[PDB]
């Protein structure tokens, strides 16, 4: 859906996206290493 956001929130939403990409990245790397083993 669509909403217009304040300044404080968009920083919060920007970071939580940054966390998840890193979290997927760190989680995504671990699986092939054990898969390779």
């Amino acid at each position: 859906r669509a909403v217009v956001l304040g300044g404080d929130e968009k920083k919060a939403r920007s970071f939580i996206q940054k966390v998840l990409t890193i979290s997927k990245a760190k989680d995504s790397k671990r699986k092939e290493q054990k898969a390779s083993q």
Partner: peptide
Amino acid sequence: EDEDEEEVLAM
């Protein structure tokens, strides 16, 4: 749910 969301009138 933030993924369900899309921002508008960005400022």
